[PDB]
Structures are given as structure tokens and as C-alpha cells.
Amino acid sequence: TDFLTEAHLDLPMEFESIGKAGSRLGTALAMAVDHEINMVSLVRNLEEFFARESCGWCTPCRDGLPWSVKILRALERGEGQPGDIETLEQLCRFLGPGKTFCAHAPGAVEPLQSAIKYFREEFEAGIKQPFSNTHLINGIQPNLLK
């Protein structure tokens, strides 16, 4: 289920009330996160669970939850690179209902998109390195894309 802030604490625990807030009522067993917990680490643990509990049937969950896991691991260690949060948002919008075979992957990406929506400064603080996908090959001039 999606994370909610303290402003949403004055909301009735009904399906339709939490639905319009941008979350799900779910099992109605709420879990509270204090200020001491880094949200990047918490969502990394959540995504590690959701990526190791994939059944491997369908491509977006099976091959996109580990990509988000590795991105969140890089953000945890400060090794994030530009385009990582954009990749997380693309994963969130491309693992929704209908895109994947079952509902495990939308429920996987709901806390990720909620944490990006409400706590983007914690995710932006993990990007410290410039983007580097290629290493220089001697004798070959690279295509310096702008």
C-alpha cells in the first residue's frame, strides 16, 4: 500500500476514503514510520522483498523490480546517477494494473511512487555521481551525445 503522511491521518479507514487519498485500505493493519528511518532504505527493503517474492512469470515485475532494487541500493550508498529517479517513475507507471500479469507488481510499485511523491528530497540526496554507462575504448572516439 502507498505511504501516507500525517495530513492523511485524519481520514476514516474505509476503502473509498483511502482510495481517493492515493492509497489502498488493504488489510487495514497500518504501520507507522518515524523521522529516524530513512525512506530510501525502507523502500529499498520493501522492493527487495517484492523482487525476491516475484513468481517470475511475467516480464515487467521479474525484470523491473530488480532494476529498481539496484537503483535503490545505489541511492542508499550514495552511488546514484542522473536518470535513476526518472527510471523509478517509469517503472512505477509501467508496472501498474493491466501491464503486469497479476497484482503483485502494482502493489510493489505503490510504496515506491508514494515515497517519491512525498519524500523526493531523500531520493534526490542519493545522486552523487555523474552518469557513466560506458568505459573508454582506446582507439575509438565516443559519440558525445548532448
Binding site: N138, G139, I140, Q141
Partner: protein, 197 residues
């Protein structure tokens, strides 16, 4: 190891050998190419004829418009089907001794033009003495072919007179340049990287 026109040995008194060596020296040091323009390879040939390369230094700048006065036919260009009888007639109009250099992939084999209107190499209908790969060969490749032809001319046996002696032409079977340069070509390890100038 020669070729008589059959694989025979070297036919070469000692005064006749000196006379043959003098004749071969005069023939290889004075080679008159025929002015024949087929395609782009002719442009690189005449580039070799100009001041920045100076093919005149080898005595091979007298470019004749008449096949009678020319000794060397450089087929430098594509051998088109309409141009092939012209090439054969111009080769037939030449006089002994005559030598042929195929310049470029078109004259060697047809090159990239394996097409309905191209004869696949000039060795299909005239005998070639020296082949040059390239499309086009650079001018110094034409110079190197001229030195290859000179080395081939210097070790061939031809009759001194048409009334005395054997009238057959004995052309030497040279070692291939590939086998000769295989020692120095395989030993190459590192070349300059292409990103520099």
C-alpha cells in the same frame, strides 16, 4: 624456374648474357606508358605523373597517345563491355616488347562491379604482368607497381635479333610479394590509434 612463350630453366656464352642484361636494363629504365583513360584509377595514375609524385624520375613520363610508341599498357579503370574490344585493339596495336599493369580492383577482377555490363577483370582477354589492388590505388602504389615491373623485366630473356638465336620469350617466375613480405607483415604488433592524425 622460367616460363617460355612451359616451365623451363634459365637459358642463360657470357657476352650474350651481358648483351641481354644491357637490353633489359635499357628496357626497364625507359618504359613508355600508353595514355588511356577508363575511370578513376586513371586519375590517380596521372596524379602520379604530376609534380608532387614525379613519375618522370623513373623515366616513365613520356605518355603516348599512340599505342605504337608505347611499351606499357596500364589498364586503369573498369573494363566495360563496350570498352573491352577497344582495349583489345589498342593492346594488339602495340609492339614487342609490351607489358600490362592492371591498376585497381576493376581491372584486376571487376571489383565491386560484378554487373551485367562489366568484364570481370582485364586478364579475361589480355595477359597481365603486374596487378595493383586498391580502389583507387594511391599514386605511390602505381610507382611500386612500376618497380615491380622493372624487376620482372630485368630478369626476362628475349631475342636480341629476329634473325639470330632463339625467338622465344622467357619470363621469370618471381616469388610472390605476399610470401616475400609475410616475414615483416606478421611481425607487426601495434599500430597508431585512429583517433590521432
Amino acid at each position: 624456374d622460367y616460363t617460355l612463350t612451359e616451365i623451363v630453366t634459365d637459358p642463360l656464352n657470357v657476352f650474350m648474357g651481358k648483351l641481354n642484361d644491357m637490353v633489359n636494363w635499357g628496357r626497364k629504365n625507359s618504359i613508355w606508358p600508353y595514355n588511356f583513360g577508363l575511370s578513376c584509377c586513371y586519375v590517380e595514375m596521372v596524379t602520379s605523373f604530376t609534380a608532387v609524385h614525379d613519375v618522370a624520375r623513373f623515366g616513365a613520363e613520356v605518355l603516348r597517345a599512340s599505342p605504337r610508341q608505347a611499351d606499357l599498357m596500364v589498364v586503369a579503370g573498369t573494363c566495360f563491355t563496350k570498352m573491352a574490344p577497344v582495349i583489345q585493339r589498342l593492346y594488339d596495336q602495340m609492339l614487342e616488347p609490351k607489358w600490362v599493369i592492371s591498376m585497381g580492383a576493376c581491372a584486376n577482377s571487376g571489383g565491386m562491379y560484378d554487373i551485367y555490363s562489366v568484364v570481370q577483370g582485364v586478364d579475361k582477354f589480355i595477359p597481365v604482368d603486374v596487378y595493383i589492388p586498391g580502389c583507387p590505388p594511391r599514386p605511390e602504389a602505381y610507382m611500386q607497381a612500376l618497380m615491380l615491373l622493372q624487376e620482372s623485366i630485368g630478369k626476362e630473356r628475349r631475342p636480341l635479333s629476329w634473325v639470330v638465336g632463339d625467338q622465344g620469350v622467357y619470363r621469370a617466375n618471381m616469388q610472390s610479394e605476399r610470401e616475400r613480405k609475410r616475414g615483416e607483415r606478421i611481425a607487426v604488433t601495434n599500430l597508431r590509434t585512429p583517433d590521432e592524425i
